[PDB]
Amino acid sequence: HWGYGKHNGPEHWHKDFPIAKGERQSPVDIDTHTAKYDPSLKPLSVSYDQATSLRILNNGHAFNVEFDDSQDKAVLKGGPLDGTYRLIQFHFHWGSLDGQGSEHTVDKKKYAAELHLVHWNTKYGDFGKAVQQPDGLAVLGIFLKVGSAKPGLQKVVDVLDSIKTKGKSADFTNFDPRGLLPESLDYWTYPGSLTVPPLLECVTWIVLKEPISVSSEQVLKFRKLNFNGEGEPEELMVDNWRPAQPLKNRQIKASFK
Template identity: 50%
Template sequence: MTTWKSKAVHPLWTGPVPVPGGSRQSPINIRARDSVYDPRLKPLQVAYDAASCMFVWNTGYLCQVEFDSATEGSGISGGPLENHYRLKQFHFHWGAVNEWGSEHTVDDHVYPAELHLVHWNAVKYQSYQEAVTGENGLAVIGVFLKLGAPHRALQRVVDALPDIRHKDSRAALGPFDPCRLLPACRDYWTYAGSLTTPPLAESVTWIIQRQPIEVAPSQVTCVAGLVGDVPLVRQFP
């Protein structure tokens, strides 16, 4: 069975925070043995335009890389998705120590950090803002980070961090293809869930990569130094 984890309220969130009273709140603890193989699920189609990468910025509680979400064709489709979803941004979640940082867990195992690539349904909605709270509005790819060898693509982001030490500061990153942050094996779990930050809307199709990517402890440290059950199915047999 897939179990829900309690949602902590971040101290830097501002304004009213909705009470997560729905039945599809994220993140969850993935019970691998209890996930159901769905032969109808096809591989996820991923194609990003590296030139649509605009900047990396310090939101005050996240290190976030923004993309021009008006770029047609830069995003994902297939898999559990009925429409094409355009890439909006990616960001990282981490913990106070390198052993405890991911939002989702697998069989109660916590990874040092978790990458989220956020996409919006550009077929059904006119803008990202509208899609955030809309039905099937968002699709988020989740990638776990484990400690090991340095990750070459991630280093591009790490190298830009000294320029965004202060809240709301931004720095150009240049052309960047987020495909380089995805694992070689694209097997995934998927479920219908919610945003993990306000407004906590239950508008997200989660696509959690089964295989983590390997990053150096120093890379995680640099990023961290900046600042009811629903069906869970899997694409792999």
């Protein structure tokens, strides 16, 4: 099936998903000297006070923290967006070593990891319908560097032992995703896609400038997960990032001077 290796990695994905070579693929390199400051961009509104996490899942590519998205609870609005987008899940991408792991890059710099908080446009009624629309998703992307521990992440790290292998899930209630946000909400934005198959071109990307710091111990626990299922040959869940894709006919816009 698709994955991150020699034989089924990103360089192969186009065979099953020809949109991989499309016009608006993600991630991309953010060239900070060309991104234009756009004074028409609004502050991002992140309203996560009523977020209801339900469960964490090892899907065989990453782990997903899932939310109850049956009501307007946890919503992203403003910024570059028109309307209201509901939080469905978050996950990460990370490396085997701290010098790689992010999907977006900044002037070619790779961070140790990248967090994606995935939200769908409530004008399309459900997630499956939204991913069929060019404005269906808003993904908030946050870089991770290694240094001080992020206290807000520790609940996530300490449940990973229980979801080591593909197909495992665990109850994961009352997790507050505000604890994963940096101080500033300054951002870059551009139109793009999901970074895993089916690679749909339905995302407004919002990539925060300011990384969060996590500890080496924290990221080390991400790297003990497994891509394989229970009892199969152990292949550590590392390097689950797609590299930068061509920018083509797109502009990256900065919310900040």
